[PDB]
Symmetry: C3
Subunit: 240 residues, 3 copies
């Protein structure tokens, strides 16, 4: 019965495959130039690892340091994170959206788009912003805002122009008076008045630099893209 | 003492629970119409798996250790089979190794995560990326990808941007033209007489039977003038610089 | 041999390190007021766990025999024992290599083994300098993975309407130059002196009656905007991805 009571326990070597080929199951920690004792798994077999002075290469009953044949690079052996630690690093289902660049038509089993269905956040078309308990814009999960496009707007101040109306250069029409069209400006002829002196008239004295009534203009802005350089990725989440 | 021995090693079957029920522990690799031999875990027992032609169901068989019956001790194993006690083979899962899971695990404190759960019930070992305990303070921020070749983004933690912005700009300078007419000034009062000092004198349209006034003429032309240039100052209204956003918490695993 | 064989199966205790110290391997579930039996791993040894009424502490009893609820010197807080997620469940929560970019705040010069920056090399997305936006099957801007757009800066643009300017030419305020006529420069506007004509009566003349409000041809101005920063408050993190 000892044959049946050896083959029965021998199947436990295969449990090393849960760690993976060339995994360090236990121990094998570096001190200085020495690696501590431990347990390794190689090609379907669980081995006690007898340490001592490090030799960057190992060989195989137990595993110890070597070089030559059948030398295995000790760099190929990996230390593991425990299932306890992996479980602690696992966030509750439905709370941890993930970035996804794979096929949107082949979302992995148990996963879905964060689209508002099945209790998910609807993250479609959104830029994420960090929750901030002290900012009213971001002090709760799911607070939204922002716009894809914006149109600039603004005002112009009111301004006047100046124009100088000259007292000179109006030219002349017709002859001495005589008559002048009613409401038509009268000018000098350049000639002295004959036999008479006109005290009621004078040459104009100055040009007139006039200021216009103020005016402004309406500004009509063109729509612009409010988005910083973006890259589309899907937000997916594990449901179960 | 062999009772204590069996009871001792039998506890190792419980290690299959690390994989979970109906796990493929080792082997059982598909090769066309074939599945290789391997090791499986079902209902608290670790079993050798005997492969062959892939079938939809498997079962625990108990057969004689003597594999020939020419002219009795049993062994238990799992194989492709059918009927009472058989299990759908599709319920058996191949696993990712702990070595591979460890390689996919980023160091503590280096991997911020999106979180939509309760901010008052952040899981054990995790905290908000708030600047405490050596974390990045990601509160109120939009993340931008590190770029070693862009001075805006060439270090972790480089910040910039503004929630609000005010557009600004300039206007060019323009002149206008205006035509001053020699006609249409109308009239006020009567013959001279007197006219207000510095007030434009115009024709009355009347002709007296008098000595001609040689010192005067009707004006000859209208006057087209160009103004001095002018511009305007633009005062922009503040605008929201943010694209459509959604608030999520950035959390990180510390330990 | 009841020794070199007992030594042979004892090595399997080290497989409990895959779960980790104080792991609940199997069972030990709250079933009302009681905790079920199971298997636990403590200090390099796999032990059978004997249950009962949920106690706060446990002990190794006869060390190398079993674990059960017991308090006092030698006891271990039961709360230090952790239930585990199976490898089957961890495998289901594992996304395919190359499909899952991750935020990274560690050293950019020491990116972990098997990981790389999402920089466009080795079939990766080039996420350098980008703000991520969620895929949306209903929005043509975001209806395929990797659609891009947006700009770091923007320059506002716009137009001004056309307006005409008015100016009023006054009939008064031209002042005077020189004396009575006499003579006035040819083509120079004649104004009143404010004095009565002495001997003559000038019926051919009158004071002007009105000021003249004139309108210009319409004008506009060209607006030239200043460049502005299009980014909302940002924080630089690296996007990395697991390749293999
Ligand atoms: Mn203007």
């Amino acid at each position: 019965t000892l044959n049946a009571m050896q083959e029965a326990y021998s199947v436990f070597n295969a449990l090393g495959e849960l760690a993976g080929n060339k995994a360090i199951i236990k121990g094998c920690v570096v001190s200085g130039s020495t690696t501590t004792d431990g347990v390794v798994y190689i090609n379907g077999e669980v081995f006690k690892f007898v340490g001592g002075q490090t030799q960057s290469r190992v060989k195989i009953r137990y595993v110890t340091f070597a070089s030559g044949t059948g030398s295995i690079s000790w760099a190929e052996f990996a230390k593991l994170t425990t299932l306890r630690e992996l479980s602690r690093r696992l966030l509750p289902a439905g709370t941890n959206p993930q970035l996804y660049s794979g096929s949107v038509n082949n979302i992995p089993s148990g996963w879905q788009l964060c689209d508002g269905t099945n209790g998910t956040e609807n993250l479609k078309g959104s830029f994420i912003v960090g929750y901030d308990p002290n900012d009213s814009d971001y002090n709760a999960i799911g607070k939204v805002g922002g716009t894809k496009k914006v149109t600039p707007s603004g005002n112009l101040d009111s301004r006047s122009i100046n124009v100088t109306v000259p007292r000179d250069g109006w030219s002349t029409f017709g002859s001495g008076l005589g008559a002048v069209k009613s409401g038509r400006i009268v000018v000098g002829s350049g000639q002295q008045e004959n036999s008479e002196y006109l005290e009621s008239l004078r040459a104009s004295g100055i040009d007139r630099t006039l200021t216009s009534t103020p005016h402004s203009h309406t500004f009509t802005g063109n729509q612009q893209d409010n988005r910083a350089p973006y890259y589309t990725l899907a937000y997916i989440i594990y449901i179960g």
